[PDB]
Write an enzyme that holds these catalytic residues in place. Structure first.
Site, short mmCIF file in Angstrom:
data_model
loop_
_atom_site.label_atom_id
_atom_site.label_comp_id
_atom_site.label_asym_id
_atom_site.label_seq_id
_atom_site.Cartn_x
_atom_site.Cartn_y
_atom_site.Cartn_z
N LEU A 117 0.84 -1.19 0.00
CA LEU A 117 0.00 0.00 0.00
C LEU A 117 0.88 1.24 0.00
O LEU A 117 2.06 1.19 0.34
CB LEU A 117 -0.95 0.04 1.20
CG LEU A 117 -2.18 -0.88 1.22
CD1 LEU A 117 -2.98 -0.81 -0.08
CD2 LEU A 117 -1.87 -2.32 1.62
N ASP A 118 0.28 2.36 -0.38
CA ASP A 118 0.97 3.64 -0.50
C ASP A 118 1.21 4.24 0.89
O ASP A 118 0.56 3.88 1.87
CB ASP A 118 0.15 4.60 -1.36
CG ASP A 118 0.94 5.80 -1.85
OD1 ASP A 118 2.14 5.91 -1.53
OD2 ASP A 118 0.35 6.65 -2.54
N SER A 119 2.16 5.18 0.95
CA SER A 119 2.32 6.05 2.11
C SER A 119 1.10 6.94 2.33
O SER A 119 0.87 7.42 3.45
CB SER A 119 3.57 6.91 1.94
OG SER A 119 3.49 7.72 0.78
#
Ligand code: NDP
Ligand code: SF4
Ligand code: SF4
Lengths: 176, 80, 383, 303, 208, 111, 114
Positions: free
Chosen positions: B38-40
């Site tokens: 998942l993204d930051s």
């Protein structure tokens, strides 16, 4: 050279202070303003009846431009595109073709009255005085379609009167 | 009533309550950024969701250095 | 907390104002302006000089000849042309007429913006005669272009100055009757005395111009310090305000109207019969008789209206005393037939910049009186 | 096709699309949304009106400069209708009042109006005539409304054989008849399946049918994705309207108690290709006017 | 040369030459060009590290008062590395003089934000931020003045076209005003008016 | 005299000694300026000339109309502003050589 | 090329400021969708906010990311105030496009469009 105002002191002489007190208590200057309003009440009104007395104007009034034509002759325009070059709203649209006679002429001379700021630059830029800002104020149009004048609405509008336009130009061709 | 196992369970159900996590696959060494992909963006979403549920202000550098659900629980046990 | 009112574009000009007020006596007001944004600078960048002169005619719209005079003097200053003397005197006469018009509209719209109804109607009958003069001179009701760079175009017809003389006498009587009506009117003095004081130090740092500098002390007239035209030959004096009041500023505007009457009288009495336009066919267009019976006049007419005259490369900033203040125009011209970038210093914009210091310690009816008491038209404030 | 009927460039606002639509009715609800999507397409819309010019004034600023055009007509003279479809690419029939008058009844509006216009549009020589009809219009009884629309479908299938009969369900929208009719009340509790479908999906279906041939001749039916019960619909619309509450003709109440059914013998939206939307988004859109200040999405979805 | 030619004065020209030389002597750190034009208005062309020192010097120092600030603009010039030119236009009160402090900048540089030494420059700086795109650091408020809120693109550049990218119209679908790409009804015919034949020989740049 | 024309400028009471202590502070803070800069020379020149005008005046209006600067308290504000820039120009070191030059194909105009 | 910064020194402070601004935009949406009386659920609004943050993802220069942070902070202040109306917040969305497709074939049937 300066002339400055709002410089008075309240004079402690009895007459000045009792006159300011009489102004404050007996309502002098408010009744004086009422007297001024009554003085304009008893005048005659400076109104004009519109639908019977149209207001005054000038012989160089600008509005409802239309194309002129020669005395007992053809159209006066050349399609030289000076008016399209000078039109600051960029409202003029000219497309030119010559007819079978050989004189240079048009096909399309379309003006948007909506875009037209009504300067007078197309009145004064035309070398043969073909397009002239007319006399009147008669537009009052219900639709946005109808305020886009073709060449033939312009020629019917220049044939609905020339006597007016020729009279205004003959009145004022020695200034411009 | 604040016990550390209740802290781990409450972080567990609010991460389950978060919808975009796919699949569940939850642990103490889960590491929901690179093991779960998942993204930051999702990192700061999760940590501000902790802030919204039962957290302190949780400043953004400390928020950035969490990266792990058991370590989220341990930071909550740290500041509380 | 505090009441954040949102005064929309309804009429109390047209703006939006967000005031975080305390309790009928305010705290923090912010004018959101820019609602009347048109794009004048980009449009002038993509047009020529003569064609984009009406943009300078109508970016300010109540003054209608001083803005033309400012742009035409910008172009005549950059292009090194002294206009002929009769053009200069007609330009001075119409500058004073437009000054009279703008001051009397500012007085009447401030009176109606407070709520007094009738001198609005009186002085707008007077301004109907003003527009009759503009009609007879140019042909337009309001937006007479009429001021070419290169002098006055198409001089006034025969039989005008007698009408201006009659209008001068009757208008002096009518402004005396306006001072009879208002001005020691007690409730109006109660309405505006101690509101909007302005320190002259803040009048210089906030960049106030024109009537605000007259009201707040320091003596500063462009017409007296830097004569940009034949103003040095007409004799007049400028009014100065002692206190920073709004009532003081009203008195200053009325006395500037009266000095405009003086300058119109001397300009009628000292008219020279010189010439309409300049003695150069490459800038002003030649007259129509020489155009028809001359080859070079036809060539100069044709090129001067298609391409226009070129302007030498350079940058200038001129500014003239419009009735609102130092109306400034900064032209930047690459050597070509189109200007490269023009920009406009608006006295209304500079006055509206100091709305916080003019409405910090007063109530909201006084905020409406402060917005009215500076001749702000909200089309010039936009640039 | 002549030139100036070929398309040019992008869509809408003096971007010339290639259809000229004569749109009958068009002053009420569905015709106004369809003129909205045609002005968004950038076409020429010939709307005839028999009413005051104030209502066509309210639907006037939709199209661009002179794209839409106005003309008068009547339900008596074929000459004005032939003048309306002198030269037209397409023509759509959207007409019918939900209550009787003293001059026009439920009888012969749906028989005398579409026969005359279909006859004069066949004789004028146009293509792609699209006629809307209501769903479940059958010769079977319980509505003069529905039996007249069934006779109308049979007659517009008989004359002008290359017509597009299309039929929506009880459409709902921002200025709906039946959902606004539900909100404006005071009621009973029974069971009846009913599927509303939102109006912009229906008019996207109509514009795709009007510019996307291979759909000529075949009759289409619009089916909303919900297909649920009326009682929970009424309780959901009251719950979203924040009011508990536990021309009204008999034909209208029997229409809203007619069990709307669907048959897959005619294709729906997917063989035409536009996405349908569920109730709740557009329901929260239209259900304004709660109270002074005043989610619980029910979503019954039966069967 | 006497009729219809603007007579220039040499006293103001000599005085502005002497004063520009004096200014560049007493501020050696930030001064690059000192030019006087033919109509005697001073221009000082300036590196963008000394906006606060030059304007604090010029508002004070008692030999050049320059209390008043006028036009501020940053004329959007391509062809250079540093595009924008910020023009502070200073007017005195005790002296009747006009100087133009012209500092240069590119698209991504904070200049030192003269709002603290000229309170008139507040809306001027905010307007130049909104229209051109030059950010000003250590400044109280930067919002959008003279533009719509949903509009962006910094429109007074030469790169932004004449007609914008968005165009508003009301529609009855969503019952509101929406933004659509521009579909003009007329071309805006651009004219090729820049004729040859070199109308000024005195401004010929030297060729390569 | 009483109530001069400017609004937020209330009148003074002792012009002479106040202006003298202003200019002694000017010469002090300017004495802390380095020498080989031109700025010290020009400021010390104009301030010694102005103070030497001030040294021999018994009157007020004669000093107002004789010493330029016009009105008497605007001179005092002007002196306070010049002291403020003297304090600021102890910093900022403007007499140092030029900061880094432009690309030099820039200040030509006609493009 | 020793360039003056805006706010930062490298991409680290850039990432810190953009995640601060995203946290603000995340906690700023439901107040506005309750206030301006929109028609769109909170999840779709948050998805298009993170879409607007994913649009500029290939930006690398630190001054540019600082200036985008300034743009986003200005618009977040103008939306947390009640200055912007319903029109502009719906103008962020796209409901009235009738969007043009991206296949070559449907760009061929409505041509002259590279
Ligand atoms: N529940 C619904 O809304 C559904 C409706 N439909 C169909 O949609 C169509 C439009 O319905 P709707 O907009 O809701 O209601 P309307 O009655 O308001 O629309 C009908 C339109 O035709 C006009 N019209 C009707 N009768 C006549 C007549 N005798 N002479 C002239 N003009 C007439 C109407 O008024 P005017 O004369 O002023 O122009 C209006 O413009 C109808 O044909 C209906 O069958 C289909 C399915 C569901
Ligand atoms: S300027 Fe006159 S002659 Fe030339 S195109 Fe226009 S109307 Fe015709
Ligand atoms: S008066 Fe109208 S048509 Fe003529 S030049 Fe002006 S804008 Fe163009």
């Amino acid at each position: 050279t300066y002339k400055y105002v709002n410089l008075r002191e309240p004079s402690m002489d009895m007459k000045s202070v009792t006159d300011r007190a009489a102004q404050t208590l007996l309502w002098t200057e408010l009744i004086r303003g009422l007297g001024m309003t009554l003085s304009y009440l008893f005048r005659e009104p400076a109104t004009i009846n519109y639908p019977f007395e149209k207001g005054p104007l000038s012989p160089r009034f600008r509005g409802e431009h239309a194309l002129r034509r020669y005395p007992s002759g053809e159209e006066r325009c050349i399609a030289c595109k000076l008016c399209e070059a000078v039109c600051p709203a960029q409202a003029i649209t000219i497309e030119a073709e010559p007819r079978a006679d050989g004189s240079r002429r048009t096909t399309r001379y379309d003006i948007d009255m909506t875009k037209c700021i009504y300067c007078g630059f197309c009145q004064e830029a035309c070398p043969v005085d073909a397009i002239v800002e007319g006399p009147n104020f008669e537009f009052s149009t219900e639709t946005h379609e109808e305020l886009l004048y073709n060449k033939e609405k312009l020629l019917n509008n220049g044939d609905k009167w020339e006597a007016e336009i020729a009279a205004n130009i003959q009145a004022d061709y020695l200034y411009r | 009533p604040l016990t550390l196992e209740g802290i781990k369970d409450r972080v567990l159900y609010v991460l389950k309550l978060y919808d975009k996590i796919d699949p569940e696959k939850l642990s103490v060494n889960s590491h929901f950024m690179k093991d779960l992909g998942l993204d930051s963006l999702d990192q700061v979403e999760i940590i501000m969701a902790m802030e919204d549920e039962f957290g302190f202000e949780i400043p953004d550098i400390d928020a950035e250095k969490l990266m792990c659900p058991q370590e989220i629980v341990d930071y909550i046990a740290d500041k509380k | 907390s505090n009441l954040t009112l949102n005064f929309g574009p309804q009429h109390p000009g047209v703006l939006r104002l967000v005031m975080e007020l305390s309790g009928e006596m305010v705290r923090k007001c912010d004018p959101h302006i820019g609602l009347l944004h048109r794009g004048t600078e980009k449009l002038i960048e993509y047009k020529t000089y003569l064609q984009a002169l009406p943009y300078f005619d109508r970016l300010d719209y109540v003054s209608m000849m001083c803005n033309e005079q400012a742009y035409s003097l910008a172009v005549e200053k950059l292009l090194n042309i002294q206009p002929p003397p009769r053009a200069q005197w007609i330009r001075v006469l119409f500058g004073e007429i437009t000054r009279l018009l703008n001051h009397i509209m500012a007085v009447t719209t401030h009176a109606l913006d407070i709520g007094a109804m009738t001198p609005f109607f009186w002085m707008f009958e007077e301004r109907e005669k003003m527009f009759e003069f503009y009609e007879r001179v140019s042909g337009a009701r309001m937006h007479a272009a009429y001021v070419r760079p290169g002098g006055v175009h198409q001089d006034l017809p025969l039989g005008l100055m007698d009408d201006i003389y009659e209008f001068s006498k009757n208008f002096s009587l009518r402004i005396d009757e306006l001072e009879e009506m208002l001005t020691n009117n007690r409730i109006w003095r109660n309405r505006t005395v101690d509101i909007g004081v302005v320190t002259a130090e803040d009048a210089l740092n906030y960049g106030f111009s024109g009537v605000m500098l007259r009201g707040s002390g320091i003596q500063w007239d462009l017409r007296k310090t830097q004569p940009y035209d034949v103003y040095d030959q007409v004799e007049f004096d400028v009014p100065i305000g002692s206190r920073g009041d709004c009532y003081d500023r009203y008195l200053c505007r009325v006395e500037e109207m009266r000095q405009s009457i003086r300058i119109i009288s001397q300009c009628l009495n000292k008219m020279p019969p010189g010439e309409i336009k300049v003695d150069d066919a490459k800038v002003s267009p030649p007259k129509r008789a020489e155009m028809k019976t001359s080859m070079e006049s036809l060539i100069h007419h044709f090129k001067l209206y298609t391409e226009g005259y070129q302007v030498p490369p350079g940058a200038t900033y001129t500014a003239i005393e419009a009735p609102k203040g130092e109306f400034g125009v900064y032209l930047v011209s690459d050597g070509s037939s189109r200007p490269y970038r023009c920009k406009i210093k608006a006295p209304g914009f500079a006055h509206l910049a100091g709305l916080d210091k003019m409405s910090k310690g007063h109530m909201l009816a006084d905020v409406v009186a402060i917005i009215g008491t500076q001749d702000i038209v909200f089309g010039e404030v936009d640039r | 096709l002549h030139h100036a009927v070929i398309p040019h460039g992008k869509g809408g606002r003096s971007s010339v699309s290639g259809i000229v639509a004569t749109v009958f009715g068009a002053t009420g609800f569905l015709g106004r949304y369809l003129v909205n999507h045609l002005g968004r397409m950038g076409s020429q819309v010939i709307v005839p009106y028999r009413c005051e010019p104030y209502d066509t004034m309210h639907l006037r600023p939709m199209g661009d400069l002179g794209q839409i055009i106005f003309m008068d007509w009547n339900g008596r003279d074929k000459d004005s209708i032939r003048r309306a479809v002198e030269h037209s690419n397409v023509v759509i029939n959207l007409v019918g009042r939900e209550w009787e008058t003293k001059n026009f009844d439920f009888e012969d509006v749906f028989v005398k109006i579409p026969q005359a216009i279909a006859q004069v549009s066949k004789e004028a020589g146009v293509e792609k005539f699209i006629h809307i009809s209501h769903l479940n219009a059958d010769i079977k009884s319980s509505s003069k409304y529905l039996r007249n629309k069934a006779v109308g479908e049979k007659e517009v299938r008989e004359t002008f054989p290359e017509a597009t009969i299309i039929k929506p369900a009880d459409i709902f929208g921002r200025e709906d008849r039946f959902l606004n009719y539900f909100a404006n009340i005071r009621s009973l509790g029974k069971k009846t399946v009913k599927q509303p479908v939102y109006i912009v999906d229906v008019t996207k279906g109509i514009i795709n049918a009007i510019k996307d041939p291979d759909a000529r001749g075949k009759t289409f039916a619009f089916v909303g994705p919900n297909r649920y019960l009326l009682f929970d619909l009424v309780q959901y619309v009251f719950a979203v309207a924040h009011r508990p509450f536990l021309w009204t003709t008999r034909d209208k109440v029997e229409r809203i108690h007619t069990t709307d059914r669907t048959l897959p013998h005619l294709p729906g939206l997917e063989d035409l290709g536009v996405q349908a939307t569920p109730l709740e988004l557009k329901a929260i859109e239209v259900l304004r006017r709660h109270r002074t200040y005043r989610s619980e999405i029910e979503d019954v979805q039966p069967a | 040369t006497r009729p219809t030619v603007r007579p220039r004065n040499d006293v103001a020209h000599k005085q502005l030459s002497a004063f520009g030389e004096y200014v560049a002597e007493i501020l050696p750190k930030y001064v690059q060009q000192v030019q006087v034009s033919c109509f005697s208005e001073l221009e000082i062309c300036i590196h963008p590290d000394g906006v606060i020192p030059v304007l604090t010097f010029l508002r004070d120092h008692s030999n050049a008062q320059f209390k008043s600030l006028a036009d501020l603009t940053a004329v959007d010039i391509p062809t250079r590395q540093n595009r924008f030119e910020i023009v502070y236009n200073l007017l005195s009160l005790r002296f009747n003089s006009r100087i133009r402090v012209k500092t240069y900048t590119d698209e991504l540089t904070p200049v030192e934000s003269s709002v603290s030494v000229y309170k008139a420059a507040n809306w001027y700086e905010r307007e130049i931020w909104d229209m051109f795109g030059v950010f000003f650091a250590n400044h109280p408020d930067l919002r959008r003045i003279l533009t719509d809120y949903g509009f962006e693109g910094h429109p007074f550049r030469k790169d932004f076209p004449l007609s914008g990218y968005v165009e508003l119209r009301y529609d009855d679908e969503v019952k509101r005003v929406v933004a659509e790409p521009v579909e003009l009804a007329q071309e805006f015919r651009k004219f090729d008016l820049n004729s040859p034949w070199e109308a000024f020989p005195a401004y010929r740049q030297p060729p390569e | 005299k009483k109530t001069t024309g400017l609004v937020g400028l209330a009148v003074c009471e002792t012009p002479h000694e106040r202006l003298k202590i202003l200019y002694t502070k000017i010469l002090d803070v300017l004495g802390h300026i380095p020498k080989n800069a031109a700025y010290r020379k020009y400021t010390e020149q104009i301030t010694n000339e102005k103070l030497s005008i001030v040294k021999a005046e018994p009157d007020v209006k004669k000093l107002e109309e004789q010493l330029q600067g016009g009105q008497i308290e605007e001179v005092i504000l002007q002196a306070e502003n010049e002291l403020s820039l003297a304090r600021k120009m102890i910093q900022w070191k403007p007499w140092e050589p030029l900061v880094e030059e432009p690309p030099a194909s820039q200040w030509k105009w006609p493009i | 090329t020793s360039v003056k910064p805006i706010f930062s020194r490298d991409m680290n402070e850039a990432k810190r400021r953009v995640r601060e601004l995203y946290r603000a935009w995340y906690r700023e949406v439901p107040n506005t969708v309750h206030l301006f009386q929109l028609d769109i659920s909170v999840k779709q609004g948050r998805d298009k906010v993170r879409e607007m943050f994913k649009k500029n993802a290939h930006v690398t220069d630190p001054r540019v990311v600082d200036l985008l942070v300034i743009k986003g902070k200005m618009e977040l202040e103008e939306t947390i105030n009640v200055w912007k109306q319903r029109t502009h917040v719906m103008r962020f969305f796209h409901e009235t496009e009738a969007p043009r497709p991206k296949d070559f074939l449907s760009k061929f049937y409505v041509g002259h469009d590279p």
